[PDB]
Amino acid sequence: IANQPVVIDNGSGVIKAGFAGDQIPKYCFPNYVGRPKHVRVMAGALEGDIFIGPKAEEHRGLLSIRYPMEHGIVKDWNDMERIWQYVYSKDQLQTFSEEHPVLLTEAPLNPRKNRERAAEVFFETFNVPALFISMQAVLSLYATGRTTGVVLDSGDGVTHAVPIYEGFAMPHSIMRIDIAGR
Amino acid sequence: DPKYADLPGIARNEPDVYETSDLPQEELTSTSVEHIIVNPNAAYDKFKDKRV
Numbered sequence: 252i253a254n255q256p257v258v259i260d261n262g263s264g265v266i267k268a269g270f271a272g273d274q275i276p277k278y279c280f281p282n283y284v285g286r287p288k289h290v291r292v293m294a295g296a297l298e299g300d301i302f303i304g305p306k307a308e309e310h311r312g313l314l315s316i317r318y319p320m321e322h323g324i325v326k327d328w329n330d331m332e333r334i335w336q337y338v339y340s341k342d343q344l345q346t347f348s349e350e351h352p353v354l355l356t357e358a359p360l361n362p363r364k365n366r367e368r369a370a371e372v373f374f375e376t377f378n379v380p381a382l383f384i385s386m387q388a389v390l391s392l393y394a395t396g397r398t399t400g401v402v403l404d405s406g407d408g409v410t411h412a413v414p415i416y417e418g419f420a421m422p423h424s425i426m427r428i429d430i431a432g433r
Numbered sequence: 434d435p436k437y438a439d440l441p442g443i444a445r446n447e448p449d450v451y452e453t454s455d456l457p458q459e460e461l462t463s464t465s466v467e468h469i470i471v472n473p474n475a476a477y478d479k480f481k482d483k484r485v
């Protein structure tokens with residue numbers, strides 16, 4: 252647990268997350284994996300063959316980049332699993348799955364099966380007590396504070412403009428194109 | 434000198450020896466750049482359990 256859970260923002264290119272009650276997502280990092288390509292000549296060197304985070308943002312030309320989420324849709328689910336595990340790390344979480352009523356976002360206009368598979372992971376595999384996932388615009392309604400609005404959020408690989416009214420948008424007044432500067 | 438007495442050919446004064454008068458790196462301190470030291474044992478200790 253009955254303490255600070257984590258708010259997790261998506262991103263096909265950069266995923267975000269952070270401990271609740273704060274004002275900045277405590278940990279933000281891109282949505283890909285870095286795996287090298289050279290012979291382990293000198294033993295005892297950088298080994299593990301899978302880098303995410305500082306080594307990924309460090310050993311740029313030393314790895315092999317692979318984004319698991321495309322057009323805001325994850326297809327390399329196992330890579331996102333490992334990315335979640337990077338979030339679970341001692342550098343980031345230092346917790347277990349059974350410790351918080353964690354939060355997560357999800358942009359609309361998506362098949363439920365994605366969310367279903369994520370639920371299967373975070374509930375069958377991870378024994379998360381409570382993991383909520385919502386849209387990606389009420390968050391902005393809280394930030395702006397206003398009730399009536401037209402929320403636009405330029406995602407990592409998505410764009411979607413939706414007019415909401417007091418946290419109740421039309422289930423039809425929804426505009427979206429999965430695109431960005433990529 | 435047994436045999437020498439029988440020798441009609443004997444004359445001294447000059448020895449039988451040929452001996453006259455007797456009369457008896459920047460690739461280390463190159464100020465250009467820097468280098469390494471030997472340190473064998475502690476380098477292995479440094480690389481102690483750095484195996485496969």
Ligand SMILES: Nc1ncnc2c1ncn2[C@@H]1O[C@H](COP(=O)(O)OP(=O)(O)O)[C@@H](O)[C@H]1O
Nearest residue numbers: 260261262263264265405406407408431432433
């Ligand atoms: N300073 C910047 N200038 C121009 N484009 C940027 C800048 N920072 C981020 N972007 C672009 O905006 C996107 C940021 O997406 P983000 O809103 O984090 O995605 P999501 O909402 O899906 O998590 C990236 O694709 C990036 O190219």
